[PDB]
Amino acid sequence: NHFDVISAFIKSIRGSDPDATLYWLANMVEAGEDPNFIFRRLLISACEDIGLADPNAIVVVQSCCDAFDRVGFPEGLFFLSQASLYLAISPKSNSTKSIFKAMEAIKLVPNHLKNNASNYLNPHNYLQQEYLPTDLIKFWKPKGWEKNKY
């Protein structure tokens, strides 16, 4: 049941609602919830829910955890609030979970991709060349920063 509050909190972040985020956040801290337990979920969210929409999201959130470590309560509340608000208002993407589609397919390396392959063409020196095996298909599904990169 405190799993229910942190769930409401993370779904609020995922839904881009900074008000509900703070509300569930305040709920957890009036309840004396463990801050490392909040931070671990923020980190995961920074990569599972924001991810390549803003690839510096994990950087900001880690700085907020480190800062919290040095500082603790009552002041640390600001790190919790910045990191929570920061994820709530960021653009969203779950394209980092594309790894699971690839793990499903997995469940032999082309020659040109072998270590010290003799017929590898280095893209820096220059491109058509195949990176998947012959018998294989799109695993990565882009949805922010990843849009421009795409």
Shortest Cβ 136–its own copies spacing (Å): 7
Phi then psi for residue 92, to 5 deg, are: -120, 145
Residue 26, Cβ neighbours under 10 Å: how many?
Answer: 14
Distance CA 22, CA 26 (A): 6
Backbone angles phi, psi at 24, to 5 degrees: -60, -40
* Minimum gap (Å) between residue 32 Cβ and its own copies: 13
Shortest Å, Cβ 73 to its own copies: 12
